Write a protein that binds this ligand. Structure first.
Ligand SMILES: N=C1N=NC(N)=C1/N=N/c1ccccc1C(F)(F)F
Ligand SMILES: [Co+2]
Ligand SMILES: [Co+2]
Ligand code: NA
Length: 263
């Protein structure tokens, strides 16, 4: 029961996506060594609310206590903005912003690397993003979700990394999570054939080591089961008549906003 967004609806996604991508533009300057994840959440929430005049879709969603998730190193997802957590040299850092504005969600996230990169997180972060872009490039009317998922996996495995299975991109709209599920791997289960006007996310979680994850005592923080690094990027898109438009693109992104397969 995939909604097909209207024109007016799609225009609201664009706004909401820009909003969400703008939070992540805003925050980069403040992503330095010595800063606290607790501090960043403070910063993004103030902005979301006061400046952007939007709400976090994070906050109180299943009891989520903070306004953005911010995962570090071997934290895979849903890390908790913690006033005592500080960023060190060498850290790979995901911050996931999801925003509602005028009743539509925008949902995006990115890796920041902090101070002096290391070769390994410099790399895992690169593949992770290329595995998103690869997939972004496949989206068009009549392709199957299954193809996309299979493709992300191969890319990712060929580099000696694994795709986290527990999480998936998703339908998005008036709801955070809508059909379809966007698995980032192959499944006889998946058989979705895309149509002009579906909105959804692509957001592969990629581990440097093995694909097994583990939730912490706090009920929230997911880690690598082998403490290997993990990394994620996410975008929201609309399928178009000839391809896709990416609705949460940033100035720092290197793929076009509009993507066409037509002649
Ligand atoms: N699937 C997701 N893509 N972006 C997000 N923020 C996603 N999920 N967030 C979840 C999922 C379950 C429970 C709580 C959250 C929260 F709060 F981080 F948003
Ligand atoms: Co997100
Ligand atoms: Co998402
Ligand atoms: Na991580």
């Amino acid at each position: 029961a995939i909604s097909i967004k209207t024109p007016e609806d799609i225009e609201k996604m664009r706004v909401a996506g820009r909003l969400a991508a703008e939070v992540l533009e805003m925050i980069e300057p403040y992503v330095k060594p010595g800063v606290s994840t607790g501090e960043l959440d403070r910063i993004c929430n103030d902005y979301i609310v006061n400046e952007q005049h939007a709400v976090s879709a994070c906050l109180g969603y299943h009891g989520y206590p903070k306004s953005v998730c911010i995962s570090i190193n071997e934290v895979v997802c849903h890390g908790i903005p913690d006033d005592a957590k500080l960023l060190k040299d060498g850290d790979i850092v995901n911050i996931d912003v999801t925003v509602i504005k005028d009743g539509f969600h925008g949902d995006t996230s990115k890796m920041f690397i902090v101070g002096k990169p290391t070769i390994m997180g410099e790399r895992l972060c690169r593949i992770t993003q290329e595995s998103l872009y690869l997939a972004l490039r496949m989206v068009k009317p009549g392709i199957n979700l299954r193809e996309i998922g299979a493709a992300i996996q191969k890319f990712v495995e060929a580099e000696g990394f694994s795709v986290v299975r527990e999480y998936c991109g998703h339908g998005i709209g008036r709801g955070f999570h809508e059909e379809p599920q966007v698995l980032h791997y192959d499944s006889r289960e998946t058989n979705v054939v895309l149509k002009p006007g579906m909105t959804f996310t692509i957001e592969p979680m990629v581990n440097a080591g093995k694909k097994e994850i583990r939730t912490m005592k706090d009920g929230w923080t997911v880690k690598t089961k082998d403490r290997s690094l993990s990394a994620q990027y996410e975008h929201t898109i609309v399928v178009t008549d000839n391809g896709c438009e990416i609705l949460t693109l940033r100035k720092d992104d290197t793929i076009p906003a509009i993507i066409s397969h037509d002649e």
